[model samples]
Target: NSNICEVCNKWGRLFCCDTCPRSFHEHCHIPSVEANKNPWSCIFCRIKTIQERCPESQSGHQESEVLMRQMLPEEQLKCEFLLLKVYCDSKSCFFASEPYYNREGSQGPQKPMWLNKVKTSLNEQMYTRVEGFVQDMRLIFHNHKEFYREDKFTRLGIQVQDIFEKNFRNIFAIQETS
Candidate 1:
């Protein structure tokens, strides 16, 4: 009696959960939705599903798979860029986390790749920050001409690596915020 009424198209009829194909009596269907009338999954499937970004390129995950939704998508991207920027620039730093440039013999800590994370940005604030930083820092660079590689106003006075880090970090942060 607990299993089924075993009737065809009757009110007490048995229908299989599309997912498990385990027969649930019409009344036995608890919590309703089955193997996905919408794909027909039921209790067992619901228990096992876990949230992870799908790699299939077709879709990420259904709403049900999400355990805890996080903040705005753009905000998450912003954080990513922030961390990446700090990581990249500091790898060969002086005003950065390292004591000197991460030198082994003299070159420095392995420098960041030039093109790998060079993403484009649309935020005006980003451009403003970078332009302002460059301008502000350039005056300092020029003023401190003696520390640089050449009196050409680069070295500690250098322009190339300094400009590279400034732009890279700002550009990355700007990209994700939008």
Candidate 2:
């Protein structure tokens, strides 16, 4: 059991997952765990459990799936792939890692966005619609541009934004509109 929370990579009180090598600080885990729970499993294990039970939805694989009011399991998987693409394309890890700590003098409304936060929101099932997920992805890049304007990091943000849009369309088979 190596030390440090898997997500934050910092030393802290951690909840070790019974099913994996991962450990998470209480708030670091999605839906954040309480210290007393036992036989806890991480999100990866839970996803695996669902996949084994339900299997992948293969019907109408070539057609675009509607972003309904409630996200279907297949849609959830699509969202996962979309987020993974953005995270992987963010070369420097600056935009995907923990958010900026120095928010003291940043700007109005202090609503910071990051890839991990978006992933956590997804795991928490905060998104009732695919558009909600899309909005958060856009916000991550938008926040970068707003806070880091004209900086090289903002350019990287644009690159990843392009990658995100491309994958979002492909993964969800979404047709272009407007």
Candidate 3:
């Protein structure tokens, strides 16, 4: 009777091992069944056994460290400020400023209409910082054109684009024509 091995789908040869429970093609079995006195295991079972015996892989802490090491000082600064902006916008943030009301309301003490002034000042400051960073990045790319000619500018440009998109999303939401 001819029997087929379920593991490698080979016929005519059988192994005595109960754990693997399959035969192998003469070429597929390691050390050649004809020359060996011991029972043979398939290549797949050997690889699985080896993997099961090894220790678990480590976390990506070193990869994260290397990534942090690659970040430029300017990128780090921008990331810090971006974090600050997010924190300030959060309700729980201590640095969050209160909403200002106009002096026309009778509930509060009369003060100079300074809410718009404050907003304008903040917008100007943010714009200046953003522009300075963009200028510096541009100068760096120009000086190191060979290194940064492909992706660095495009990636940084997307951050600038995001700022504009965020500012304009609400602006355009208002139906001015209506």
Q: Of the candidates shown, which would achieve the greatest TM-score relative to the real structure?
A: 2
Q: Which stretches of candidate 3 lie over 4 Å from their true place?
A: 6-10, 16-18, 30-34, 57-178
Better by TM-score, candidate 2 or 1:
2
How would you order the candidates by TM-score, starting with the best?
2, 3, 1
Better model by lDDT, 1 or 2? Answer: 2
* CA error at residue 134 for candidate 2, angstroms: 0.8
Tens digit of lDDT per residue, candidate 3, span 90-149? Answer: 221221233232333223313322222323333344334333333332332233333234
Evaluated with lDDT, which candidate comes out highest?
A: 2
Stretches of candidate 1 exceeding 4 Å from the true structure: 1-87, 90-92, 96-131, 146-178
lDDT by residue (24-131, candidate 1, tens digit) is 454333332244465565443443342124223223333222212232343333332332333233332333322233323334323222211222221222322333
lDDT of each: 0.35, 0.67, 0.35
